[PDB]
Symmetry: C3
Subunit: 163 residues, 3 copies
């Protein structure tokens, strides 16, 4: 709080002592540079919690969405939440996608890209067939099913990101 | 803190100034409406951290568990933790489950339901067969394997929720 | 803050009142036992947030990495982040791995072990074949594909942990 000096022989001493006590007391309830048990507040700095942090409301992390046709009709939808990317595979295969081939319509943007190669396991509607798509750190996704020219690929999960 | 007024010509001034300073100083160490570097405390309000939040103890989010037989002997076990649902598929197929059919014994409750269709990829014990089960926002789960009358479906992962 | 007593007839009263007000005011901006809206600070105690916690920087949880050859050439790479373990399956099958057999080269260490059996679904490069590996709470992983003597298993996801 903004306070005024108190000193011997001071002019208007009781008033200044009171003004100071009030200015300081004000910041114990709201405002100033102190974090309080009520109120909407923005907190800067590295805050390290050594105990148990319990969130009863919501924990909101940085979020961003993206969707694109990776290639061959396969559509990847992403939502970044903190250091995790939630993915969903969709669309329908529209042309021959060769075994172990790069999907070269659209790459995953760098902000959604993992540190390491992530293998996203999926299933084709209608039978027992599984595939995976790798997202490397470059974002050029790669199809690791066999050669396929049709069908409906699906799979929801997550992969990690960092910063 | 609860303080008393200080003023000119005041009765018992030194005592009141001291009582005030002590009341205020007390809340710099514990209690009142200020968050401290020690102590168990409940904090209300929207707290926005613009820096790095580091948790060394535990981060505890709202948690809830549920398990049920979706249909055809397939059992889904769920644990909600914040905006993420951890799932585990189990049981054994007990009757004919037709391709792309709704599982109509029990639905996933709304509090465990996703915003969008989530495709949960799984594997059948004993061979190379994969399937997926979709959980739509309605919670009426849908089997996207082919027609199956037996076997042991498994798969653990997560899907997102929001509020 | 460290303050000195104020009292009637006191020696050097104005100085002491001022020193106290300054000591207290100092802790409203930085240091002491109060959490502030700026500065790097370590916070002990159970902090329960009943409102909305919004993190704009980073949320950092306890992290630890591990990788090992589970058995048969299958390599599992793990990163624990809080109560979640991010996994990646790799390597190449190097010898006959019997159906539903324990992988008995290396177990997952206890700190990476789940509360319950986690079924990690994966895909074999080059065809439509899926498998899963179970990680029980003991960490002795188990192969639930059929008998396999070759091929390239992949799959990235997460499973939960607790404390």
């Amino acid at each position: 709080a903004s306070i005024k000096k108190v000193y011997r022989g001071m002019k208007n001493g009781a008033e200044t002592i009171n003004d100071d006590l009030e200015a300081i007391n004000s910041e114990l309830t709201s405002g100033g540079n102190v974090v309080h048990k009520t109120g909407d507040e923005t907190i800067a700095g590295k805050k390290t919690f050594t105990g148990n942090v319990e969130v009863n409301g919501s924990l909101t992390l940085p979020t961003k969405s993206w969707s694109g046709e990776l290639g061959g009709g396969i559509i990847l939808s992403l939502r970044k939440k903190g250091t995790t990317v939630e993915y969903s595979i969709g669309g329908e295969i529209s042309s021959s996608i060769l075994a172990n081939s790069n999907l070269v319509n659209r790459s995953v943007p760098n902000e959604f890209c993992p540190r390491n190669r992530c293998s996203l396991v999926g299933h084709m509607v209608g039978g027992w067939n599984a595939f995976h798509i790798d997202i490397p750190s470059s974002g050029v996704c790669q199809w690791f099913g066999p050669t396929a020219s049709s069908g409906t690929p699906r799979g929801t999960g997550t992969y990690p990101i960092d910063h």
